[PDB]
């Protein structure tokens, strides 16, 4: 359950990301594939080669939903609803995988946002992420 301060941080942090989010969303996906190969199991149909256009374009689609999750900070459960069925109904992605991607956005963000990624902010974005991951995982049963 996010705090008024947590929000403010998530917002000003994602606010620096800016246009460079697809970038980050892709670098994250990639950081996840090399570090946690299990996760490629859900992407049998992708070209996971370093630099692939499929991945890159996907990284924009993830990065966006996040932007959207941000945009609807006080209504994530409903805002991201289509995404819950997909990852929960259709794809049935096991949650440990959400802990992992979240761990990579953090790293990623951390690698592009030096002055932004302060302990306080690192705490909030981690909180925001657990939340997104919580909603996209809920309709499991």
């Amino acid at each position: 359950m996010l705090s008024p301060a947590d929000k403010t941080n998530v917002k000003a942090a994602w606010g620096k990301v800016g246009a460079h989010a697809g970038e980050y969303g892709a670098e994250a996906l990639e950081r996840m594939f090399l570090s946690f190969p299990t996760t490629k199991t859900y992407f049998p149909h992708f070209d996971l080669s370093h630099g692939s256009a499929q991945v890159k374009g996907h990284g924009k689609k993830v990065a966006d939903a996040l932007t959207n999750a941000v945009a609807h900070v006080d209504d994530m459960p409903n805002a991201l609803s289509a995404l819950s069925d997909l990852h929960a109904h259709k794809l049935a992605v096991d949650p440990v995988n959400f802990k992992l991607l979240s761990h990579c956005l953090l790293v990623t963000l951390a690698a592009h946002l030096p002055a932004e990624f302060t302990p306080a902010v690192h705490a909030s974005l981690d909180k925001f992420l657990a939340s997104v991951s919580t909603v996209l995982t809920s309709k499991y049963r």
Partner: protein
């Protein structure tokens, strides 16, 4: 620990630039802010009430150095972690009673701090070596828990 020489060299090379006095501080420091409940292990450290109290707490800074030492020293022994950390695991188990799950957190919070110092230098491939290393360390530490 299944670490190709490429991963081997990639790991150390980087570790060589790491300011231990610093990285040691930031890591336990974040661990303690991003995951507040762990503070229930350090009440002897004085003020921990806010993120500044913590990051600056001298006792947090002193203790993290210690953490890293042990790390530096596992990297000098990648092929015998279980043994390298055998005494430390016992202690964490018998004396301090720490759920080994917390080791994974520290490790991952570590990996995050490296990425914050080095930037584009903490390429994906380098991160992968490190992920393998912190996982190895965490298991070694959980090994003698009985």
């Amino acid at each position: 620990v299944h670490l190709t020489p490429e991963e081997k060299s990639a790991v150390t090379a980087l570790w060589g630039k790491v300011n231990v006095d610093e990285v040691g501080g930031e890591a336990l420091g974040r661990l303690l802010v991003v995951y507040p409940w762990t503070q229930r292990f350090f009440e002897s450290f004085g003020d921990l009430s806010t993120p500044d109290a913590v990051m600056g707490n001298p006792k947090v800074k002193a203790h993290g150095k210690k953490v890293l030492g042990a790390f530096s020293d596992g990297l000098a022994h990648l092929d015998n972690l279980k043994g390298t950390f055998a005494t430390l695991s016992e202690l964490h188990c018998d004396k301090l009673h720490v759920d080994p799950e917390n080791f994974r957190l520290l490790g991952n919070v570590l990996v995050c701090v490296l990425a914050h110092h080095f930037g584009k230098e903490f390429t994906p491939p380098v991160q992968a070596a490190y992920q393998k290393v912190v996982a190895g360390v965490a298991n070694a530490l959980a090994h003698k828990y009985h």
